[PDB]
Symmetry: D2
Subunit: 495 residues, 4 copies
Amino acid sequence: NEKLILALDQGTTSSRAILFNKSGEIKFVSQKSFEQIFPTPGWVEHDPNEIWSSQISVAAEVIAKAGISGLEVAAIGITNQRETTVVWDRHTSEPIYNAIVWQDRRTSKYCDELKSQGHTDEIKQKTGLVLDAYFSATKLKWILDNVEGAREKAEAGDLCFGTVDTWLIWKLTRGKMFITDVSNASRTMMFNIRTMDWDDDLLKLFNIPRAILPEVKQSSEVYGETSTTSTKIPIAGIAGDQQAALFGQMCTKPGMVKNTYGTGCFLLMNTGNEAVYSKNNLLTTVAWKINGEVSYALEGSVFVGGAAIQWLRDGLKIIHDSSEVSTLAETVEDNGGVYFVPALTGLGAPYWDQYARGTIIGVTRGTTDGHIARATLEGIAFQVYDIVKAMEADAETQSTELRVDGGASASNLLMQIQSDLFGFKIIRPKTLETTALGAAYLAGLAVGFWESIDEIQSQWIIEKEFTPKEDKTKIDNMVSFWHKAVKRSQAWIED
Amino acid sequence: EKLILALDQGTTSSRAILFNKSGEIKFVSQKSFEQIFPTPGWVEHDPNEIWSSQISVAAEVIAKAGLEVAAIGITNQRETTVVWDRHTSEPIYNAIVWQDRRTSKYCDELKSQGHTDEIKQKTGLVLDAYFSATKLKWILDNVEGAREKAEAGDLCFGTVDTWLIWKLTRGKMFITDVSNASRTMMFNIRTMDWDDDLLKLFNIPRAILPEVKQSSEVYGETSTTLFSTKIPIAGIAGDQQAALFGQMCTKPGMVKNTYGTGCFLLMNTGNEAVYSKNNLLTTVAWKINGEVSYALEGSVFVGGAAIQWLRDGLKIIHDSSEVSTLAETVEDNGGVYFVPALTGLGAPYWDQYARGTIIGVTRGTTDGHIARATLEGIAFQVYDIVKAMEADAETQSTELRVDGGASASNLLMQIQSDLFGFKIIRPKTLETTALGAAYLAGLAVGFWESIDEIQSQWIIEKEFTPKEDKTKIDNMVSFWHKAVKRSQAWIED
Amino acid sequence: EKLILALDQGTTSSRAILFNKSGEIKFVSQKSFEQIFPTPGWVEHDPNEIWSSQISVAAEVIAKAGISGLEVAAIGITNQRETTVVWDRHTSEPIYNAIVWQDRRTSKYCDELKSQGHTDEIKQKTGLVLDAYFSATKLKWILDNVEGAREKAEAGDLCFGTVDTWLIWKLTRGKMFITDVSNASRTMMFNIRTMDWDDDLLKLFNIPRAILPEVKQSSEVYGETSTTSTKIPIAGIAGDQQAALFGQMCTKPGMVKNTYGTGCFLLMNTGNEAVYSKNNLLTTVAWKINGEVSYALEGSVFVGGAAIQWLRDGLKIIHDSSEVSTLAETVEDNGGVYFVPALTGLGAPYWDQYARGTIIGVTRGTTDGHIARATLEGIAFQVYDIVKAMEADAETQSTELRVDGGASASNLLMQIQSDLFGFKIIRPKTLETTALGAAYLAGLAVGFWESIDEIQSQWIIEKEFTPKEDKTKIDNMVSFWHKAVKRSQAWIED
Amino acid sequence: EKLILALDQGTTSSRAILFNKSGEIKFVSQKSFEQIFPTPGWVEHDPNEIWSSQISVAAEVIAKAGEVAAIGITNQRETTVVWDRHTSEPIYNAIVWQDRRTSKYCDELKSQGHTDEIKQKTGLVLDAYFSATKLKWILDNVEGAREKAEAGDLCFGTVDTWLIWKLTRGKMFITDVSNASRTMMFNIRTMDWDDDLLKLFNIPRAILPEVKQSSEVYGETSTTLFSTKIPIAGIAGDQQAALFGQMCTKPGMVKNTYGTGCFLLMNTGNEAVYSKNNLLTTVAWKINGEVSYALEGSVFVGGAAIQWLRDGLKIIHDSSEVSTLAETVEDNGGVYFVPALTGLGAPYWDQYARGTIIGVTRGTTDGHIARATLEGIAFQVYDIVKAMEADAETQSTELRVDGGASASNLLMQIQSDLFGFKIIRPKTLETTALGAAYLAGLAVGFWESIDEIQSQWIIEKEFTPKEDKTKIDNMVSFWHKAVKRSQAWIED
Ligand SMILES: Nc1ncnc2c1ncn2[C@@H]1O[C@H](COP(=O)(O)OP(=O)(O)O)[C@@H](O)[C@H]1O
Ligand SMILES: Nc1ncnc2c1ncn2[C@@H]1O[C@H](COP(=O)(O)OP(=O)(O)O)[C@@H](O)[C@H]1O
Ligand SMILES: [Mg+2]
Ligand SMILES: [Mg+2]
Ligand SMILES: [Mg+2]
Ligand SMILES: [Mg+2]
């Protein structure tokens, strides 16, 4: 009979569960959104209990939807929004605070303190990361320093830290497995990517007790079975979502690159077994560990990509569904002079301005909602443009193509705009959910669903190519006004 | 704190509710699923989406609460018919919903051949497309190979309770309760067993039918899932019978009306099956501690679903709750009547060919009047089955207990009270369908020690008393009945 | 450039259109006014807002044209028919709202007159049927129900008028109190055989003769405007549907047009002969020009484009009238839904004063798309029934139909109509043939144009719709339409 | 009873209002007309639609009234119309006051040292706001225009002159002192067209109208189909008309109008006062042979930003919904909206600033956007009041307000909170039209004195401030931060 691989993809915006077959084809998908909590502008939080309820309910749903039961599932693969920090009671499994999301800006001033104290080069060398509110360590420190009774419980060994993967695996195993993988660990700013170990010097700097940390495991390995209560399904793959997308795009050789258009926008290049330090404001990170071999990546991180479309839908309410942004944008011929820097949670690479905020500029009396949707799409593509120009310099290579994926990559208009900005081709494959696909791959190799990586190479199938159709001079004048708008967005928040 | 899980698989959404021992709702999850209309008059559900929607809200509500579930009670949209391969659990056709009208002409054939009274005497039911038997026969007649498979015992028939329990136990339990079984038109409510005369009439092989059980007893436990532990399954009842039990209507003469997808008025008649003389149904309420209780029922096909049509179809409201605000933009119905026969007419009309009819429209008619007429149309339909039941019982009621999602509309309840000429009692918990399933399961595992323990949990939240002149009410009822006749005998095929 | 000014006082909006010598619309202004419903079934207009809306669009279109009133060669007047205005001869103040042709309040009295044997009499004298549609019972209602009206009327202190007469009264500050033969024929007080007010009918409705305007030809220089002001010659008057017949060049016996406006109105030119209908149509006066009277056969549908305005204003499922076509195209067919738009009862061939708007066939899958599509079909089905009645009367099978009016702009409605008939629909370049015809009447009177022959070449086909064959579907739709119509009938009782 | 007809030709719509002797509105009609944007930054009106919309509303109110003792004319200022003298056909669209196309040429004149001369002669600053560069653009860019202008075959007019031209079928070619002062071709010290400025802008004197008093029987309208000949007896630029309508006829008296833009005017008596804080010196009116002057702060986009929410962004469907939508949130949520949709007027005078929304986060709603629009209106008025207080060396304790957008109670409370003093809103918000009526009525003796009409000014509501001055100072600080982020945006 038929066997399937289950990928759980716990995203910033929704949790997904997808069933793949041996051909890498999606057979069934369930998806469920969960609340984006903003206690004050600049802060972003998730209910850790709704992360779990949304993720496990769509897991039950997709199996049921498939007409099958857990008996037909070969293995579970876990991938997740990265950096986001959960802290719970080791004995009751209750979160002691909400999850603080990677987008949250509240630790910006402390990160600036750490820069002024001289820690930038030490942090970069050990972790590949920059001193930004983006990563987990300062969020963990915030919870231990601010939640009533948290510091004393952590020093007694009664607390657990996790990125979302660890939280989900904890809940899936009734607390019997407290683990993370190297790729998720590398995003915490507590994990030395050169020694591939939690860094006691960094733990000392952040005043974090080592006992609160999970065990770091490789990205593809039978770690154990589920036991929420219950069905015994092997959990065999873990990876941060953007690394899993890289794995899902077959970018397993040095120099291969993809960009994901999801809640944010993330460009990752595989750098083999060498940690490459950026000269152009990008991150050094761990790609995965498989068969005992570590692979590294360079990364450009854009905080708000598709989330700017979600803002048009839920905040501004000028569209009813995400898919209408392209239709609305096409009611106008161009951006009409409007530029939208979507720094709704600050600016990531290459700017790293924790204090920039969302900025729409150039509005006149004839500006319409169509111009706003079109400038939203351009602002997404402008941000990816900037991290690609950073990565090309780090690589000292001019690109001729770019593989793309993620939910916002479904917009043909967005991909054409992006192609036009780049002056080279955009390549969109048949399966846009490469994040979940990569996790399925990682788990499937570990249990033997697939015999080797060569077996799954022929599954990467191009669906549509976009080629540039615009004058390089006019593109450079749009780019010029984009960079001018970005500066207008910066150094806005003072507190 | 131990809890009891109620699964309420409705016509338009699946729910999972956790109750504590005080009868309070502690956690609730709900998820809609697709209403499939292959041609006007047909109504289908995907059985795998009935299942996926029901199991995902069960997983979600358990997860929300953070092993501590004492038992599960199962309750469901009745009559809706599911047929599946016994070895694969693959449905061989969509579920054919109770509202579906495709078997109307075959029912009329059986009427003309003289099977109407035999069916009434055996099953308590009116020969109508409403019930399961003709839907199962359609599937066996029209699905390639299904007939030979059913004859060999390789297929299963179930109402939705049976389908849910099949999937919950990975095909280890193939059961229904007496209340659901009584809605199939294959179950004799006097012998309390499947009827061989009716099975031969509809050409249904007995091998395809589940075992009929009590409404409250530990049947077994759920099969191993990802989201929970093995949980006892300990209650089953058709949703409207569960609502009657949830309303504490355990004594002869007690009545409730549910305002849900449709509208359903049931009176408990004790150990006595009471045959209607006024176009109502005689049905099984439940079986508990070995004792069978019966009911008289008035069945309205489209009640809250007409509000859903204003939202999804006409799109003059964005959410169900907005129907009352919109109706309150006008002072009265403006001359407009809406017979919501969107799936034909149920009791007391039993017109399979009636269709939705809006009449009396003028140039000043607004969307406010349409909303008002929608609510009045729900209330007028309930009016007609109450008058029928008052005739059967030879009583003039002085009050009526109500529940259900659409009973949240204070305006709809005021309209209803004005039409009735007596009081309407709305309790604190409107989800009496799920509550009743919880009660049946909880009594069975001892979560509650006796029905005397749960009495105190019925709490009155608001009473509505009539306001309008009787002669004005009489005029409106007269035009309503005039509109009903304009709706009738519309479809010919 | 010399221009001709047409004033088209419609049921829904007042319009002013300036035409050149080529018959081309050069400028147009339009303004809606309030539709007043004191109780369901009643329909009233504020006569002062008819005036203020009409005089303000006249001013606006002249200013819009970069010209002044001096450049205007003449004014032609056309109007919603039957609608009844009564005002004080001395103060020009109306004594009551205008009672609109759609109004049903006089239905029971019409039935009274029927049961007293007056049906054959009314038809012989006027060509009309006993129905709340026509002016006489509305005027009688006002004299009988307005405090002091009956005394003022017998004293000669009141004026009656259809809307042409009201506008001309205001335009001349009471110096001209006139109507034309076509408007007059709609009052049920004007004998179309003698071509004069009928004293027997006046006795029956208890209407004093002194309250009636003088009936004039449809094309002749009556006098000048004089609101205070500038003298422009008023030189043409016609009821709007007869103006549309004249605007469609339907000046020879047997020529036909249907207008898709607030209602739907099918008129055939019958020349010098008043043909009496055997299929529930009206016999009416088309016009009188150069001393020559032309008659027509008419089929009258009360609610056509008004059903679209009801989707916009009442149901609010469209924002603009033109969106009805787009919404209707979101579905492939009516989905089983039928909409009998009897919002003001049923006109020809049913003449049911008590029928009311009816939507039937709704199921759980029915959408606003189907409602839009059923609305367009209901317009087309009602035109289908009067065309079939006119073919029987004429003993002729049509092979084409010239169409016009605001709702004829809908390509989907015209295709549906062509599909139902199985023959082509011809839409001309100017949809405002009501206004065009009124302009023709005034232009011929002042010599702006020399003759009918001269204007013939101005009628230019914009688009032809040819029928798409779907015989089984169409027969089934028409059958359920007739079934639906019966479900709408005999609804109101009081 | 006789009535006065005020014709208020606004930037957004044309209105006609009939007032009785008590100053109450007896009839009012309003009709919008098209805002044409050939390219972002440009703003044009169809002069034929200005005319038709104004006639339509006039004919409608005259129809309802049916006794018009006189007509007062008031209008959007600066907006420039050029037409053929013999055919009355305009040779180009009207170039509206908001239009920015002449910005680079104004900067060219600044570089060539003409700022002080322009300010001393006209009270104005070199900005695309004013008529002169718009007239020059039309004469330069429309084929054959310059030949016709030198031969005296063309007419120039602000909107008052265009309306009177059409109302009299070309028999009267006039403007008043207040409208003329806004052209940058009229010397407000000599009170006459300035030959030196005309030479500078290459404008022939033969295309200008005759400048008249603001209250005087100039003549009568021509006979129309809808009315007899009516005396035309008052003309003033709309914002000066509002100053008159607010009874601000004594030195030091101030009002602010919240209309399409926002305009703060103080009467300075018979003395032209030159600003030291980026305001304009302008002619208030001339009545009974006496010229009155004013200081003015000009905000280009006030209520027009609400119209942009309605027509552009479409998050409201009627202008009045802005307050309700803004009340769905408790504060601006960190969002600031600089409504520089046509550049920035006083005190910034940045022709190249454009509309800027800043501070957006993921939880920002359309509610916050509505609230930031109202605050942005109030912030701009805050800035011109602060500049005016510096010129006048006086701390205000109150401010009289009027205009279509002042009907928003929320907007007025925000403004009061920011100011820290009270806002006085009178019963009739149409003080522009009221002032036109007053000017016309005085001229024909409908009212026999200024003192007679004084009692017609009735306070309808007073708003008192209710917020902490430091929390306001921080909002104001961020507002000023946002303004700078909007500036020097356009390069061409
Ligand atoms: N694009 C359109 N499509 C369909 N109907 C339309 C359209 N535009 C206007 N209408 C309809 O036109 C009707 C008015 O047509 P018109 O000829 O002006 O009326 P009247 O017969 O009163 O003179 C209205 O009832 C309106 O619903
Ligand atoms: N209720 C309201 N609340 C807020 N703004 C309003 C309201 N009604 C109209 N407006 C605004 O009023 C402005 C027009 O005011 P008005 O005095 O008529 O204009 P103008 O100053 O151009 O003559 C428009 O920009 C519109 O957005
Ligand atoms: Mg997500
Ligand atoms: Mg339901
Ligand atoms: Mg009309
Ligand atoms: Mg305006």
